[PDB]
DNA sequence: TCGAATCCTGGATC
DNA sequence: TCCAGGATTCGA
């Protein structure tokens, strides 16, 4: 171990060497300094006693370019419980047993959560242990844990030690929790000298923030035609990097036909950067010149795009050929988890953020689309085939293409990413790297621990999953879940602000509105506005108008009228529900606990109970039969992980094989023994939610809720101040106000994201605070509110669409919608209020409001308040110009969200369900889809809308029948092809056949075994016809064949069809034309014809026929 | 002959 | 990280 420690000291020395190369010279001198706490790492440090001890390492940057590092020693600890009266004796045992291997032992009382008679104020002991090094702590934990395990199986001296807690918190987190240290604040640090620890203090009077230098790059390489490049055999053609707004380019003049002149490029005036070209006589000197320039630049942050698959692996695999090592020059390296990470600068990557937090629709994640959407311009693309040749004949064009991804990457990172990561990281104590890479699961627990810590609460141990949980009746379960909410389209069609439609409204329904109007408007003012009604100058006038309009509604219960459209949305419903009932993961107490809580006395108001729906899924085997098969397994013998190891009795096996062996044998038992093997069961359970557990969780959510609204307020203020800076045009003020605006914008979004995360954690597998019932109560009662709204709205008018958290609906144009009250209050003389909002925000109030909120008055008194609180509110979006909602071809099928809607300005304001296509898609259908939406804006009434549609939709179906011979021949390939690409290598597929596999086979005879010989394949193909009735999987032929030499093309065409005598050989004859007509027929069916028939319009295309079921229904009804 | 139940493999921006 | 889509098997 001493040699291992010496190796760790060598690692330390090497890291100090690199930090010196990057100017992160350690602090040595007594004094105080101020700086920005950019990054931190763990490292172990030798003390003045020459004992190696664990430490953490903090990196700072000044307001100038100077930089420094400081290190803190701090001994980790973990807790063990005890049986009664053991603590002193057990302490003497441990200190005898582990002398020199534990540093200190201590007795501390703590707030348990599960201790009976909890809230009277009792608490239990724990023992704290302290260690010099994490190695020794690990080794002692490995020794200790089995002795607890044996006791839990029962549930010398070690038999008395019962439990242990917080044994697995990452060490570099621990410090930040204990010392309140957090990143991207300003800090002030003083070093007294080695006789003292460093003293470190947070600032909060400084808000202006420094700017780190930022660099990004991209790399362009050779490849061989029709395969992926080889890390060992391909070579580099050009490399380009953008830094602080200046572009640099380098290129391989041994490959490029001519050297490149320095030039300039800008897609939009925002994106300023020009470029400059270095040039070199050989490839190796490219990489040497790169590493020299980056060493001289010594930049702190380094942004790439998808740094896993390609770039760093490539530059590494072509370092060794010339004896280079970036792991010496820059000091980057791979790590056990697979990614690249480095001692002193942090590798950062937009793609993780795009995946995790963009909310862009699926399949738009491809770089060009994401850039276009966020940055608002179209970057241009060349086919990766053509680019390799183009190098030979027009270099300037290739350089002008390749440069673009530098600019796009740099500005994407700066404008969107860089405000977000640090701002969010101001709240949550991890490193800027982990918070970007981590999922939203672990992150929220990494916050929540802070609160649990300062409340002095001992953490629970991880909720490791059980195996084959037995049911209450003794059935073997396989799974459990809460019954979800659902989404469906209630009806389908097209709707517009200006085309007549029909309604029936129940004539008695409006009565239940008109008899409550005044109260409702009172609530609408007093609940939301909080302006006293005594300020209102015209309260009666508007109510009298509304009454008259509701009377006009009652006068004609069924009507022909133009429709409105609105979207009703319960913004952030789930957090509000959690705030509304005092749900806490600790507080869903069982009933048995109320056998002991001294507060459970007659007149107790504190019990509150709610119901949720649970799903079982279980096999039919009875409890005695599982034991009967166990008594068969008791005889059996199994091979261990290596058959060279001794064969194991069932006693010796690990659980993860036992469980599968018994489960499969019980399954094969049932498969014969019972007629059906899985039972699915729904059951309704009633749970009690303890109203008086410690409040810290809800107080956390409340704090975040209110802070978000404060920051949105300040963001609005600063956006106004920015508008004033734009008017004044003073660059200094523009700089200041824009930097404030972006700061608040980022911090506001960050709080939104974390607040949405607060729901998703509590269901996650293995989470520390886990409880199925937290999903149950909140989800079910949430869906229950939607049913109330649906039941209310369907009497007034048809609901079109029913979201997870909202509704789309029509209302009749005559229905009252929006009003202005007038008042004396100079703060707000007149106020606008929307009538559906008032209706919903009163209807929810009567049922949902909570009568049972409680809160503690004085810890020593145990006097408690009673209170009521509510925070569900509906919100109204609309109107919208037009809406389209397609329907699936099948009889009565259910759906998933698919719709579109349009703004009055003609923008496609929202769409959903029209995915960007997984696995690739034909171009023709793509153009058809985007084209047809253009038609719907035109037309007078129902017939004329389709009169517009048909005179565009016909245009393609004519082209396919005609073959449009006038069209240039290459465009058909552009118009019909598929680019489906595959990842395995041919022999990985085995004895199998598929369009891809058959393509892989047929292609090879063009050029040989090379394309099978190495991994992955990419191709383009079309469907052949003449071998009719063999399925399409066999009929595909690769496009490449057309380009081949005429006699070879003849030979293979005469082979691949089994065609004996063919004389005509061109795509016009050979295409399986009408297969693509079927592709068209199966599109145009679902978007147009079915909708048109569903609302009784003539079949809008003679060429296509209704699916037979629809025809038989339509003929029966007419 | 016709309808329902069960077990299986793939998905990642490429 | 499990949902969705097709093929196989059993009942009437
Ligand atoms: S229901 Fe009442 S008595 Fe029972 S644990 Fe909760 S607060 Fe205590």
Numbering used by the authors: 27 to 181, 213 to 1175
Could you share sentences copied from the article?
The second intermediate (the Frayed Substrate state) displays a frayed nascent strand–template strand junction that is more reminiscent of the Mismatch Excision conformer, with the two terminal bases of the nascent strand unpaired from the template. In the Frayed Substrate state, we observe cryo-EM density at the junction of the template and nascent DNA strands that can accommodate two bases of single-stranded DNA of the nascent strand at the entry cavity of the Exo domain. The atomic model of the Frayed state shows how the terminal bases of the nascent strand are loosely held at the Exo domain near residues N363, F366, H422 and N423 and traject away from the template strand, from which they are physically separated by α-helix 3 of the Exo domain (‘wedge helix’) that obscures the direct path between the pol and exo sites. Despite being melted from the template strand and held at the surface of the Exo domain, the terminal erroneous base is still located more than 10 Å from the exo site in the Frayed state. The upstream portion of the dsDNA is released from its interactions at the tip of the Thumb domain (R1041 and Q1049 at nascent strand n-5 and n-6 and K1050 at template position n-9) and moves away from the Thumb and toward the P domain. In this configuration, the coordination of DNA at the P domain is more extensive than we observe in structures with matched DNA, with the backbone of the nascent strand held tightly against the positively charged surface of the P domain formed by residues R728, K733 and H735. This ‘handover’ of the DNA from the Thumb to the P domain could be initiated by the Thumb’s tilting DNA-binding surface during the transition toward the Arrest state, which the DNA compensates for through an in-plane tilt that brings the upstream region closer to the P domain. Positions n-3 and n-4 of the nascent strand remain coordinated by a flexible loop at positions 970–980 of the Thumb domain that harbors three positively charged residues K974, R975 and R976.
